[PDB]
Structure formats: structure tokens, C-alpha cells
Amino acid sequence: GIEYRSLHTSQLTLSEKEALYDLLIEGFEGDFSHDDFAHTLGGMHVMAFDQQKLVGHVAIIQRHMALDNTPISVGYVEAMVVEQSYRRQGIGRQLMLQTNKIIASCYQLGLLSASDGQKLYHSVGWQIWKGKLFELKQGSYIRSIEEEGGVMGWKAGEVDFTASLYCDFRGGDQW
Amino acid sequence: GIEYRSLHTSQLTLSEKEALYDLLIEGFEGDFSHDDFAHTLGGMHVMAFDQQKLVGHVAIIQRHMALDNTPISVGYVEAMVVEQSYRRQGIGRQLMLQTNKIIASCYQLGLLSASDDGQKLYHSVGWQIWKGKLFELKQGSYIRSIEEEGGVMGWKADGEVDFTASLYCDFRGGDQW
Ligand SMILES: CC(C)(COP(=O)(O)OP(=O)(O)OC[C@H]1O[C@@H](n2cnc3c(N)ncnc32)[C@H](O)[C@@H]1OP(=O)(O)O)[C@@H](O)C(=O)NCCC(=O)NCCS
Ligand SMILES: CC(C)(COP(=O)(O)OP(=O)(O)OC[C@H]1O[C@@H](n2cnc3c(N)ncnc32)[C@H](O)[C@@H]1OP(=O)(O)O)[C@@H](O)C(=O)NCCC(=O)NCCS
Ligand SMILES: CCN[C@@H]1C[C@H](N)[C@@H](O[C@H]2OC(CN)=CC[C@H]2NC(C)=O)[C@H](O)[C@H]1O[C@H]1OC[C@](C)(O)[C@@H](NC)[C@H]1O
Ligand SMILES: CCN[C@@H]1C[C@H](N)[C@@H](O[C@H]2OC(CN)=CC[C@H]2NC(C)=O)[C@H](O)[C@H]1O[C@H]1OC[C@](C)(O)[C@@H](NC)[C@H]1O
């Protein structure tokens, strides 16, 4: 009974972006910052609607990383949420099926940082990243020690999940 | 008589993808590489059609950069082309006007790397030569992009960006800019 629409950020109205912010604030219970919202904008949104009420969301944003020393185009998953009373009905899974298709069509690798939410991602093919993770700090890479074990990856061309990943720079949490 | 469509890479038919590749090889007279084509995929396409024939294209790719020490979200312009016989009719201008709207709605700053045929057109829709230092990752360490300094141009909707500040781009294959 849910309707799914895939829209680029550039195709959203101000009120649709506001409804997205509202859904994220309510669904994360205070764990979602302004930086997290900036991270949600600029790529593709998969949105779940009950009639006209936005009830679920996930975004896929392009990131430009290194896998060891090789450049890799990444589809990075952000702001995955389903309104509380709509949970445990398969909406999050449909969001991820749609997310996988977008990634397969556009990028060499899907990545995300997971809560927990890890089991849902595993059920649609994602695996824990086994290599070391690095982020830019003051223009120089350092270990993302806190995120290791939490980042998951998905490939439809095969990628070595034991290799090191070097993400690109942003505000807030780099992963 | 030209129709414009804005489509994400994920919304493109396979037909349009192959048409795009041929259009770029034909339009660039030999200096459009496989890495250049990879750089074109993953973001928004603005496509111009004459009836059913694709005649013009520009892509806007999300990039994550540093402006001095500050993280900035970039709409990076790639793979700007109009088929030879359609040029000098304003199609490229319309492509950029559509590009400007996408950038304004999504990113903090527009950036591109221009040519001879490009600069004046981009300037005509508000873009300015980037005056600051440019840097790219080599072996995980930033170095100056001397080659590209003076050729990269930027665009800001509100217009409040220090065009003399340094830019550090994110990593990719082929040309980083
Ligand atoms: C994570 C989240 C998006 C999942 O949304 P969801 O719609 O509940 O996802 P699904 O319903 O597809 O799967 C949820 C669970 O319900 C189960 N489920 C689905 N349909 C079901 C049914 N008909 N009967 C019983 N259980 C069912 C699934 O098997 C899954 O169980 P698992 O998590 O043990 O695999 C949601 O919990 C959420 O918004 N959390 C807060 C935001 C957040 O943490 N986001 C970051 C996640 S990294
Ligand atoms: C750059 C490019 C895309 C421009 O496409 P275009 O459709 O010719 O862009 P426009 O028609 O809007 O403007 C092009 C020129 O025609 C002029 N022009 C605009 N409207 C015109 C009209 N109605 N009648 C005649 N000339 C016109 C513009 O002022 C510009 O002149 P300039 O070169 O002096 O600025 C095209 O040359 C091209 O495909 N080049 C090959 C690939 C390439 O190099 N792309 C640029 C990489 S930066
Ligand atoms: C130090 C923070 N690190 C991780 C950062 C990630 N941006 C975050 O992404 C989710 O949350 C929000 C809001 N904040 C944004 C996007 C969300 N992701 C998706 C797919 O929608 C992770 O959620 C954070 O991980 C923490 O939470 C889980 C955990 C297991 O308890 C810890 N892992 C050691 C903890 O570090
Ligand atoms: C060493 C190459 N450096 C620049 C790299 C840029 N990826 C390139 O972008 C355009 O072309 C192509 C195909 N290759 C891809 C996308 C195009 N851009 C747009 C908006 O569609 C620049 O075109 C290159 O610049 C060269 O050309 C111009 C010049 C002034 O003569 C020289 N000096 C800077 C020369 O370096």
C-alpha cells in the first residue's frame, strides 16, 4: 500500500525538503544534526508515501574515495528512516532494493555507516567492510577508528572488502 | 525547437547512455577519454534534443572539496557538448542556465574546467575564473594543480565566496579537474 518515488534533490520543493527534515528529526529521536541533513542533500532520494504522507526515506549521494590507491566512485547511503509506526513492515527493505538499483546503475561501490540497522542491510546483500578506514583531518588522512566495523559495502565488478578506504572531506561525521 | 530534459544517471535509458557517449566522442574531436566519460556518470544530466535526437548535454556531478580549511559541497560541471552543426544557436547557454539552477538548489558552489570555446560562454552566465590556489591528491597527499590554475571557473548563487581562497578537490582517475 506504499508508493515509492525516486527524486533528485534538485527536483524537490522547499516543503518537500522540509518534510524530509521533519521525518528525519522525528525518526532518529535527536540523533540527527544539521550536518547530517547537509549530507542528505545533493543526490538521489528514494521516498515512501502513504497517500500523500512521506513515511520513509533514503538518500544516495556520490562520493569520490580511494580504495587503497585506486580511485573509486561511491554511492554513499544517507538518512535512512521510516516513521516509527510504519516500521517492521518491509518499507526499509523496499527502500534498500531501490537503493541497490541506483548504485548498480551509477557507481562502483555502495557504502554506508550502520547502527540496529545492520541486519536489514545484510538481508539485501550488504557486508561489513573489513579493511581500514581513513578520513581527512586538516588536509591529512587519519584512521577512522570509531567507524571500523560499522561501515558496510555493496557491489553488484568485484571490490576487495579487505582493502583500505579513504573517504572525501565533509563537515560533521565523515562517515 | 529544442527540448531540454534533466535526468539523473540512474534515470537514463540505456539508449540515452550510448547516444551520450557517441555525442561526446564526436563533439570533442578526440580529447575526451574513458576517464572523462566515467567522470560524467553519477550525477544530473541536462540533455537537449531535436525531436528524438540528442544534440546537447552537460552533467553536474557532486564533489566534496575543501575551501581553505572549510568543507564545501560542489556541483562540478562535466562533459559539456553540443553537436557541431547545432552550435552557436544558444543551446550551450540554455544548458548552463539549467546547470546554474541545479547547482543553486543543491550545492554551495559551482566549479568547472573551461577551454577556449567555453570561457566566454560561462562568463556570460555569471561564472568567474578561480583566482586562488588549486590542489589535488597525489599518493594521498595534496599537491598544487598548476596546470589547471586560470582554467577553473566558479559560480555562486548568492555570490559570497572568496574566489582567492584555496580549493582542494576530491580524488578520481584521469584529470582531477
Ligand atoms: C532502520 C529502519 C529504517 C528500518 O525501517 P523498517 O521499515 O522497519 O525496515 P524493514 O521493516 O524492512 O525491516 C525491519 C524489520 O522488520 C522485519 N519485518 C518486515 N516485514 C515484517 C512483517 N510483515 N512481520 C514481521 N516482521 C517484519 C524485517 O525482517 C526486519 O527485521 P530485522 O531488522 O531483524 O531484519 C528503521 O528502524 C528506522 O527508521 N530507524 C531509525 C532511523 C535509523 O536508525 N536510521 C539509520 C539506520 S542505519
Ligand atoms: C562549448 C560548446 C558546448 C558551446 O555550445 P553552443 O551551443 O555553441 O553554446 P552557445 O551557442 O550558447 O554560445 C556559443 C557561441 O555562440 C554565440 N551565440 C549565442 N547565441 C547566438 C546566436 N543566436 N547566433 C549566433 N551566435 C550565437 C555565443 O555568444 C558564443 O559565442 P562565444 O564563443 O563568442 O561565446 C560547443 O562549442 C562544444 O560542444 N564544444 C565541444 C566540446 C567542448 O569543448 N565543450 C566545452 C568544454 S569547456
Ligand atoms: C561517530 C558517529 N559514527 C557514525 C556516523 C554515521 N553518519 C551515522 O549514520 C547514521 O546516523 C545518522 C545520524 N547521526 C546519520 C546517517 C545514518 N546512517 C544511515 C544509513 O542512515 C552512524 O549511526 C554513526 O554510528 C554510531 O551509531 C551506530 C553505533 C553502532 O552505535 C556506533 N558505531 C561505533 C556509533 O558510532
Ligand atoms: C590536463 C587537462 N586539463 C583540463 C582537464 C579538464 N577535465 C578539461 O575539461 C573539459 O574537457 C574534457 C575532455 N578532456 C572534459 C570535460 C570538459 N569540461 C567541461 C565543462 O565540459 C579541460 O579542457 C582541460 O584543459 C585543457 O584545455 C584547456 C586549456 C586552457 O587549453 C589547457 N590549460 C588548462 C588544457 O589543460
DSSP string of A96-124, one letter each residue = HHHHHHHHHHH-SEEEEE----HHHHHHT
User: What is the identity of the amino acid at A77?
Assistant: V
Q: Which of A41, A77, A115, A119 to mutate to test the pocket of ligand 3 (most atoms within 8 A of CB)?
A: A115
C-alpha A173 chain-centroid distance:
13
Three-state SS string over B48-102 comes to: EEECCEEEEEEEEEEEEEEECCEEEEEEEEEEEEECHHHCCCCHHHHHHHHHHHH
The answer, for A5 touching chain B at a CB cutoff of 8 Å, is: no
Chain B residues in contact with A169 by the CB 8 A cut-off are 64-66, 71, 168, 170
B69 burial level (CB within 10 Å; 0-12, 13-18, 19+):
exposed
Q: Cα–Cα distance between B144 and B138 in angstroms, integer? A: 10
Technique that determined the structure = X-ray
Determine the 3-state secondary structure of B105 from DSSP. Answer: helix
- Of A135, A127, A118, A113, which is closest to residue A160 (Cα–Cα)? A127
**Tally of CB atoms within 10 A around A69:** 11
* Dihedral sign for Cα atoms in the order A113, B73, B145, B172: positive
**Tally of CB atoms within 10 A around B26:** 12
DSSP state of B169: P
Residue appearing with cell numbers 556541483: B75
Q: Cα–Cα distance between B64 and B72 in angstroms, integer? A: 6
A76 burial level (CB within 10 Å; 0-12, 13-18, 19+):
buried
**Tally of CB atoms within 10 A around B111:** 24
- Of B22, B32, B26, which is closest to residue B174 (Cα–Cα)? B32
Length of chain B equals 177
- Give the helix/strand (H/E) hosting A36: helix A34-40
Q: Cα–Cα distance between B10 and B44 in angstroms, integer? A: 9
Percentages of chain A per state (helix, strand, coil), in multiples of 5: 30, 35, 35
User: What is the identity of the amino acid at B133?
Assistant: K
Q: What is the CA radius of gyration of chain A?
A: 16
Q: Cα–Cα distance between A27 and A92 in angstroms, integer? A: 13
The answer, for A107 touching chain B at a CB cutoff of 8 Å, is: yes
- Tell whether ligand 1 has an atom less than 6 A from the beta carbon of residue A93: yes
Q: Nearest 5°: phi and psi at B88?
A: 65, 30
What resolution in angstroms does the PDB record give? 2.0
The answer, for A37 touching chain B at a CB cutoff of 8 Å, is: no
B59 forms bridges with which residues in the sheet? B45, B78
- Of A86, A74, A104, which is closest to residue A47 (Cα–Cα)? A86
**Tally of CB atoms within 10 A around A112:** 24
Cβ–Cβ gap A61/B62 under 8 Å: yes
Three-state SS string over B108-163 comes to: CEEEEECCHHHHHHHHCCCCEECCCCEEEEECCEEEECHHHCCCEEEECCCCCCCC
Annotated binding-site residue numbers of B: 31, 78-82, 87-92, 113, 147-148
B73 forms bridges with which residues in the sheet? B64
Chain B residues in contact with A101 by the CB 8 A cut-off are 10
Q: Cα–Cα distance between B126 and B124 in angstroms, integer? A: 6
Determine the 3-state secondary structure of A83 from DSSP. Answer: coil
Strands A53-67 and A44-50: antiparallel
Strands B141-144 and A53-67: unpaired
Strands B134-138 and B167-168: parallel
Cβ–Cβ gap B139/A43 under 8 Å: no
